[PDB]
Amino acid sequence: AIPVIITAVYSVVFVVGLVGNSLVMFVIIRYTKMKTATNIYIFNLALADALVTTTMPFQSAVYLMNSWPFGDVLCKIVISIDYYNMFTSIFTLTMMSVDRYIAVCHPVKALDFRTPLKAKIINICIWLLASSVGISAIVLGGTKVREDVDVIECSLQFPDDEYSWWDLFMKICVFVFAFVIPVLIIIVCYTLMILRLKSVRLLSGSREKDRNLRRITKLVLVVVAVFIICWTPIHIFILVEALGAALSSYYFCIALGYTNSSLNPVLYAFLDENFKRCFRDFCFP
Template sequence: MDSISLNSETGNLSINSSWLNESSPMIPNFYLAIPLIYSVICAVGLTGNTAVIYVILKAPNMKTVTNMFILNLAIADELFTLVLPINIADYLLLQWPFGEFMCKLIISIDQYNIFSSIYFLTVMSIDRYLVVVATVKSRKMSYRTYRAAKTVSLCVWIFVTVIILPFIIFAKIHDEYGRLQCVFVFPNPESMWWQMSRIYTLIVGFTIPVSTICILYTMMLYKLRHMRLNTNGKALDKAKKKVTFMVLIILAVCLFCWTPYHLSTVVALTTDIPQTPLVIGISFFITSLSYANSCLNPFLYAFLDDNFRKSFRKLVECRTS
């Protein structure tokens, strides 16, 4: 669950209660700070993503293809922030009191959080690329409809569900030193299975989608540059440029928040790291940064999308009046 201590034998991230009794003052400080940070992420994420979901569902002018994908991003973030209090309780109690069903449910939502955001961003990047190609060739995209975006979004959720099935299967309650923990319980040899799970997450949850996105944006920039040379830069209107820029910024923030998490996988696979206070602190920071992505996206929409701000104001004014 929480990226606190890496156990190379079980492959799980867990809290060692003996750290709380160590002489270093850093450990108690970590122990007190992390629930506070997670609580802030939870409160901000719930408020922001609820606002995004409400505006897109209620405002008629927000029902666009891009906003359909943004809606699903917000739903994924909302799900994660809804269950974050359970993660906080698990952290504070130093054991899992909620049973095996809740263990599988919470771990599945954690895994949805890892995979769904990057794959919806991949779909959004594909959509932006197709828009640019169609504009360059002066073609109409009759198939690019709000209904089609709903179908694509459903396919993404099904695809991500298939990806995370192995994690749901291996999520179990395990007795560690007299404390029940919600962890991944792998068959023997556990270390090999743990390494395979980390490589699986790294490749499927980061390398493949990020490589796809990078290729798409490289091709898109090439076509835009070529288009400017031949059409004096008039083929893309201002609105399309703004949407493309917003998708690019959302992607950049996602990569900023999640890249350290996936880089830590590489380090964990290649290096035997001693659990010093500094390493524990870095682990706290990396986990908090990945969690923070769930509450940052609503602010990006508010800053970058004029339609979102106007629709939000109208809805607030209507409810107030």
């Protein structure tokens, strides 16, 4: 047991992920060159990641001291931000996959569909949809003291009359509606996309547009794959704990889930040429 490992990971996230996501958002907002629908979805992803990053110093307290000293309102805000990030990230990735599928397999409709204004509207709709869980976490979140160890715990406060089916039902619903169905949609979309790419890879000829499409599809696929492997262990662990060394695995899964918020810019800078150019221009004008 050495507390500086996960705490150092949390601090590295708290600084680097915040800086990178802020740079991504600033670059997307400023440059008219990079105001594209996929870039708008990337902006939403970076916004969620930066929002979840600000709560990193509060997250590390329940690991350093195993108690919540920040109060009820801060507990509510932190829980709401966590649920907002979890739902918004997966929904935005699903919409990115759908947009890529439309661009690749239905170019006739993608002209009307893939305008940046529709991307902004879809981002607002995604934030509103996830608010059904964020506002619920605001209402239900709270701090309850432990009567056996005098430890303050920050968690959702289901009625103590049942507080059992409630927790299991909410965990199952979160699993189904934030992991299973969106991942199924992403898998279907990318299976069709890969089929289309293989079909025309032999003799496609619109060099500039084909290259651009294949590069953005690559970038989106890599981002989705990184998210899936970063958030897969925590979902399975939560489901197993609800239904069925353990604490070490739990905290490792939690830490791995949070590090995904910092790897998005270090992926954009390597998978996209325009993002790399803009990062260089900002760092070294």
